[PDB]
Design a protein around this nucleic acid. Structure first.
Ligand SMILES: [Zn+2]
Ligand SMILES: [Zn+2]
Lengths: 84, 50, 71, 103, 58
RNA sequence: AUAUUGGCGAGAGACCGAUAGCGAACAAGUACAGUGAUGGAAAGAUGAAAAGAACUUUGAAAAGAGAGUGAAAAAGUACGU
RNA sequence: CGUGGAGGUCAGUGACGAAGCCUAGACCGUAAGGUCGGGUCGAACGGCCUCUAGUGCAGAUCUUGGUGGUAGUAGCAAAUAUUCAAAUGAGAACUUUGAAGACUGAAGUGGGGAAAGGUUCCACGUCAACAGCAGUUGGACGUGGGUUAGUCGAUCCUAAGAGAUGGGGAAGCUCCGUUUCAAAGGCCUGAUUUUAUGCAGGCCACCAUCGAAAGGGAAUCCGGUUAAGAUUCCGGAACCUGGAUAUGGAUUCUUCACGGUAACGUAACUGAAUGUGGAGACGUCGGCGCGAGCCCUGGGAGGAGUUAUCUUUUCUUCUUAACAGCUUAUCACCCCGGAAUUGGUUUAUCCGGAGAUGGGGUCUUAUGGCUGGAAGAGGCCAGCACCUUUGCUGGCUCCGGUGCGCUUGUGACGGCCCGUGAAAAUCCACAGGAAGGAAUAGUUUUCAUGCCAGGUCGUACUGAUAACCGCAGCAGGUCUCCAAGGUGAACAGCCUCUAGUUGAUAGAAUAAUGUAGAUAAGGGAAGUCGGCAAAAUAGAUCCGUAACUUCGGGAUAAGGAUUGGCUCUAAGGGUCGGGUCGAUCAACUUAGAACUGGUACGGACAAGGGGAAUCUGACUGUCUAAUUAAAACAUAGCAUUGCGAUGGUCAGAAAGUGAUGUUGACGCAAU
RNA sequence: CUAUCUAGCGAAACCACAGCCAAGGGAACGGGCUUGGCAGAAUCAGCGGGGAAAGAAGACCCUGUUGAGCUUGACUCUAGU
RNA sequence: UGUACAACGGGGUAUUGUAAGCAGUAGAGUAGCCUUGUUGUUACGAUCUGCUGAGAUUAAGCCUUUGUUGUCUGAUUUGU
RNA sequence: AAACUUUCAACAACGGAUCUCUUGGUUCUCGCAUCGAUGAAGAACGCAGCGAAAUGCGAUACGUAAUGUGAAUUGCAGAAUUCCGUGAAUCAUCGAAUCUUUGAACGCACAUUGCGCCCCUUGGUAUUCCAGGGGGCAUGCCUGUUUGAGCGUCAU
């Protein structure tokens, strides 16, 4: 049977977790993630996946550092002691 | 499985600590829209694909 | 755990996941001024670590845990 | 207490995961896991086995004495006694024939 | 040699036991309402098979 | 001088007004499906104020009937009409 | 006429109730539609002149959402089966306990595990939802507890393979290749502490790295313990590695042992660069031998059961770990000797002047025995006390036998091959003889003993007719280990012990038609496309068996008879005195004869229908997972074609690029 | 064992409105129309004539200035050699 | 509250085929005794014979009874 | 005749339309130019007295320091006049710091919480062994320093 039986022989993964996006996309017979070529330096992105370019792009996360630069520019990238 | 990794175990631990209800004192706040926990998960219904 | 204390000569701690049975040994040798002889660690499924230390005879774990404040 | 189990996590009957039942002091059967047998050291020339040399496994040869691994002769431990005989006769006879051809 | 329970932990943090009960009941109810809705709103296009073979020609 | 459906900050509209308008007015790129690429939702309104129904009684209990709060329970969290 | 919004206007209506909504209540208009009253309800909305559009729905197998009739209907019917009383509770066909009955029937409904799942494990509390009925129950809900490793595994090695560097290609994302056309590198003495190097003093020419929780691999066992963990914990007893280091012993003043004919031995007994060798390291089948565990069985010490009668009876406990010391063998080898009248020899036909037989010895130590561990543990029984803690006391825990038995391991051999049945880490030894060393002294850390340490991650549970996948608590599917008794050839089927379950919505009734399973007078394929389906035959022993034939088969050909139970006889072996006969142990197999019965007897289960001919494909095998298993495909065999490497066939975008090719015409490639 | 009756649980296909016939005519075979026959609540188990019964925007045929797989000495070109 | 009904029991009828148990001087033949026996005798021994056309079952959709025991006013609706 | 079926109304139900609302979108316009090897964007894990999220944050962990404000946070408990003050606060501001494991990701590798090397230091009798703490080890390229190579080449 090509169905209800042959869904029974499904117990070994062709995918596991990428260390750069954290989802089950790391093909392991070949070692490349399918949503961001991990060994590759560039993140996988194509301009036909314009939805995918919202689920991963800037603004999605914390923006630990980049959230503060408009605050720092406004003040002129000043430094030193706050004030009296 | 039994002979597992640590990444997996760590994620399972997270999913455990997530598998609790909503604390009732949340519901008494002054502007609250949260009635229950909708990100709830149990091994019968939904498998976490890790 | 409070059974393994008073039955054995054991203390049971929660320790930092980065520790390695040697740091633990020296930490108990330092903070509580005892002399362990055997550590057995494991990871709990809340992602924490648990440490069963066994204290040498001539150190009683009840006398220690009363000194701490959890009996 | 028949119908034993394995004691390790290799349920598949390889050469490494062999067992042997034993009746313990509890009066119950239990499966103890043997380790693989030891093949005799062979000779370098004739390829036959060595007489006087323990049959252990390799890294177990490090724990035992020199007497369990050798024999009091020239190529002892590595070559058969008769191969040595054939190695000595040859050497004498050659070096004497060359003398015979010199004078 | 014991003092603490979750009940004594939640006594101070607002809800007592009868309010825990009365909260759980409505919490469960609002969890079940959405299930009734999800089943209704899926029931149409759950049985929609992409490649059903229709074992009948003659 | 020019460009600018991106980012930061501002101002407005003969625009949509919760099946509309961004996919998302809400813990939405969330839940969930798929091996994976990818796909991808639903769901806003008690009332001015919780004053969110003390107390009595039947009931195994939910709940009910009386009472009571309220301007109004023909607003009782399943709550605007 | 009407709708959403815009500009003007009625100094427009309105919380003394706007808008909206219901109204077989009213009026106007041909009509689109407008207005009014009532009820409901609670905050904004209209008329008029004009502007402007996302402006008017019965429809589109329309989109989304919601709701009906059919319908309290089909139907909840595989998996042999449930019942009585009590306890709990609001409530019990379904929970718990007890008694009964029964099932899986050791290729299991048992006990564990790999993938996978992820806390489903255990407890306390609980029933709104889930468990297609119920539910006081639960893999559900709520709160919490829970996974202890120097020895198990990963980690380390490498296989098929993947993949950077240098380089070369490519517009480029990136590709080739993996030691290549690279200046690819550490490691040790003097120099004695400057340890930077003068020489040293030379060592292949290597040269990433990843890749197996089933291959390779350093080292562990018993008992006990928990709600749930344990080769991890407690107790006891051991081992390995890496390091330190001190005594004892050994050896040496002629510095680096001694014996033995020999195979070889021992508590030990320097040995560098380099080189070499071995183990790691290997198919499959068959029978033979040996062992372990199990099965069977005798005697005895204890306990339980039946007993109207019989039963020296039926059941059951009587155990001994890793590790360690001593001894223990098939093969092989050494010494003495010198074989045809050829002998020795295995189930199996090999072996000997290249030295058999024979006499005497050496080693390997799988394995076995004895002892230590280890009886003190565990088990069986009796006895005295207590909620303290749950304890205390006493006794026994012994001696055997048997085998084509079962599983398994292992050895010596044999057969099979145009098939000859992984590598590497790692460990050891040997050859060689560098350098070094002594007298209370030096080497000994491969002799014995002693000291220290042994990290990180996994470790619960199921492993499936409820924990994985299949939309699900699906009759499907998914790797493997252990494996009792009887019947019998048999792990078949049938019954049973240990262990586990007794779950699947139930009750009552017994109509048609059905599903599954059976029977049938007489005839016997007339039915039918057609003997589809079903039946008959079926096992073992003896007799007897054709044409045809590639001489191997056909063949269980066909075709006949027998088969139980009971009482017997005989032959088949081993011991010990008789055979250049006797007492005794232990066997399951064969043949025969009587007797006997409602002529029955492979008594249930299990279990071939046969024959004559034609068409076709040689055979075994393969495919259309889910309509076609076939005469198609394949096959061996036959033939043909190209190609002598600057090559044939094929590849790649290209390349200092690749498959065949670890190849070479008895080959590769194409038909 | 079902079906059947009962306690509990409880869907789906399908559905213009619906559901007695004959003849007539008619899109040439009506459940409805016309003329006649007839006609009495509510209904259970069965049945398989009918509802040109349900399933599926016929698959055969044809048309389309719609395509695709395949072949060749079709037209136009092409890797390679 | 009766020639009433039922549960049992009894009798008939019917089917099967001669029960358990006891006895035997039956019983191929083997093992023990002593006379060595036209059954000599004892033990086992499927089976055979007698009690035994016994025993078992017999209305559940058979017949009969005159024995034992027991039962016999619960609910609803209906009017020219 | 009632049940039943149908129609209408009232009340109640199912269901969530209409009306009103709107911290949301969409579109137009104006201004500004500001990521990263000083380790970005993004990811994993974890952090609160009681939180699963969202938001914030990083073992200094819904935050510390500093500046301004000048008495709150509030769901509960806890704090409490420090409240005529170097001072409350999920405040605002933000110029000092922290910033786990990662990621271009940089010692090697990574389906592993795997394996190394150098320096300083501490402990264990220890330059060598084990462990702990702190700091470093990527590649290409440039400028420069140092060392070295090549009968390429000069003078001696
Ligand atoms: Zn990724
Ligand atoms: Zn040799």
């Amino acid at each position: 049977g090509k169905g209800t039986p042959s869904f029974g022989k499904r117990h070994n993964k062709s995918h596991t977790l990428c260390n750069r996006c954290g989802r089950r996309s790391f093909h392991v017979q070949k070692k490349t993630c399918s949503s961001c070529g991990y060994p590759a330096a560039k993140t996988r992105s194509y301009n036909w996946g314009a939805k995918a370019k919202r689920r991963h792009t800037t603004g999605t996360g914390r923006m630990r550092y980049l959230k503060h630069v408009s605050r720092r520019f406004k003040n002129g990238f000043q430094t030193g002691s706050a004030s009296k | 499985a039994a002979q597992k990794s640590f990444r997996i175990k760590q994620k399972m631990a997270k999913a455990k600590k997530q598998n609790r209800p909503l604390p009732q004192w949340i519901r008494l706040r002054t502007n609250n829209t949260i009635r229950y926990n909708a990100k709830r998960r149990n091994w019968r219904r939904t498998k976490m694909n890790i | 755990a409070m059974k393994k204390v008073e039955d054995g000569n054991i203390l049971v701690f929660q320790v930092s996941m980065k520790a390695n049975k040697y740091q633990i040994k020296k930490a108990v040798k330092e903070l509580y001024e005892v002399d362990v002889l055997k550590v057995n660690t494991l990871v709990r499924p809340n992602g924490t670590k648990k440490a069963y230390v066994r204290l040498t005879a001539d150190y009683d774990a009840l006398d220690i845990a009363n000194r701490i404040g959890y009996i | 207490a028949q119908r034993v189990t394995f004691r390790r996590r290799n349920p598949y009957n390889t050469r490494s995961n062999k067992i042997k039942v034993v009746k313990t002091p509890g009066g119950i059967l239990r499966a103890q896991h043997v380790k693989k047998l030891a093949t005799r050291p062979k000779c370098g020339d004739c390829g036959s086995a060595l007489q006087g040399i323990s049959t252990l496994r390799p890294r177990q040869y490090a724990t035992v004495s020199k007497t369990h691994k050798t024999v009091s002769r020239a190529y002892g431990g590595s070559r058969c006694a008769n191969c040595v005989k054939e190695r000595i006769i040859r050497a004498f006879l050659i070096e004497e024939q060359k003398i015979v051809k010199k004078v | 040699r014991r003092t603490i329970t979750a009940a004594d932990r939640r006594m101070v943090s607002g809800v007592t036991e009868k309010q825990y009960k009365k909260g759980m009941k409505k919490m469960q109810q609002l969890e079940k309402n959405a299930i009734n809705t999800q089943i209704r709103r899926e029931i149409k296009r759950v049985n929609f098979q992409t490649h059903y073979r229709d074992e009948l020609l003659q």
